[PDB]
Amino acid sequence: LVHVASVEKGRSYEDFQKVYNAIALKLREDDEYDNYIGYGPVLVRLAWHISGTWDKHDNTGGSYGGTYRFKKEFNDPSNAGLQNGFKFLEPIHKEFPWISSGDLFSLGGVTAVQEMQGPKIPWRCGRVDTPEDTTPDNGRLPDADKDAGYVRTFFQRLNMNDREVVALMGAHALGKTHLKNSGYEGPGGAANNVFTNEFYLNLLNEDWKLEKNDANNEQWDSKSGYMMLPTDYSLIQDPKYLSIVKEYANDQDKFFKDFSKAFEKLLEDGITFPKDAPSPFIFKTLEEQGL
Ligand code: HEM
């Protein structure tokens, strides 16, 4: 399967910076969502789940085709709760009907991270919508109730290595688990709509307790009111993972730099970019624009 990036006709940096600003302006406006967390965390989760279907072996799945717009992927049990990120973006797609679905879902994730004061993420245009029959089947996204060997093995399919996996998981400092979506409940920290390295700090400094929640699932709970998933706590159980966790709890700039590279790579897996294709765009935030 080859998927070649095709820039939307005649579009350039300024067009996509207009779509960025539209998403970012609505993130500021619709602030009440999920008890004032706002839409940013569900939008970086949506960009991860449309990319996380990729399989390196046959180049199926991935962010290129925008296939989450089809019922099979929209109704995947693993995507429960992401309909709220879709409905947030649907106004903006009506306003810029020329951007492809893959591009709009991935730029929403980029915009949310930078607007929640994360690192800049280089983003590239050119994903092309593909037919309903290209939609990957349910079951390619990871279970939460498993251990470190499962996480390592699952992420080899998206060929991410240990460092990349640990840098990507730092995004679980954002938002929260919702019992009616996943059977898990609670936030992982106090700053859950500002991008920081707090996931790593909480993992190493809190007093975790294995408890059973109302959906009868086990999760790691702390006195402070935070929770960690079994696959999250996995990172301090494995010796290779645990020493990268310590590296990111001791250096927030290295965390930001490595997250930026692994999230771009995540979003680009499966796509062939021609050598005459434009460079990756670095978008300015509303704040850097005085907007
Ligand atoms: C083995 C890996 C992973 C598993 C099992 C997993 C699982 C989960 C689960 C069960 C939730 C709760 C969903 C809900 O109830 O609403 C969640 C939320 C979230 N995850 Fe993951 N995740 C994984 C990796 C990642 C990665 C790599 C990213 C992003 C780079 C990510 C970003 C998020 C975000 C931002 C949320 C919060 C959503 C919200 O607030 O609504 N996840 N994760």
UniProtKB/Swiss-Prot annotation:
CCP1 precursor is processed by the rhomboid protease PCP1, which cleaves the N-terminal hydrophobic transit peptide. The m-AAA protease (composed of YTA12/RCA1 and YTA10/AFG3) is required for CCP1 maturation: m-AAA protease promotes membrane dislocation of the CCP1 transmembrane segment within the transit peptide to ensure the correct positioning of CCP1 within the membrane bilayer, allowing intramembrane cleavage by PCP1. This is Cytochrome c peroxidase, mitochondrial. The chain holds residues 71 to 361 of 361 of the full protein. GO terms for cellular component: mitochondrial intermembrane space; mitochondrial matrix; mitochondrion. Its cofactor is heme b. It catalyses: 2 Fe(II)-[cytochrome c] + H2O2 + 2 H(+) = 2 Fe(III)-[cytochrome c] + 2 H2O. The active site is at H49, G188. Destroys radicals which are normally produced within the cells and which are toxic to biological systems. Belongs to the peroxidase family. Cytochrome c peroxidase subfamily. Present with 6730 molecules/cell in log phase SD medium. The modification Phosphotyrosine is found at Y150. Its EC number is 1.11.1.5. The record marks R45 as: Transition state stabilizer. It is found in: Mitochondrion matrix; Mitochondrion intermembrane space. Keywords: Heme, Hydrogen peroxide, Iron, Metal-binding, Mitochondrion, Organic radical, Oxidoreductase, Peroxidase, Phosphoprotein, Transit peptide. GO terms for molecular function: cytochrome-c peroxidase activity; heme binding; metal ion binding; peroxidase activity. Transmembrane segments: none annotated. Forms a one-to-one complex with cytochrome c. One of its GO terms (biological process) is hydrogen peroxide catabolic process. Its main location: mitochondrion. Heme b binds at H172. Binds 1 heme b (iron(II)-protoporphyrin IX) group per subunit.
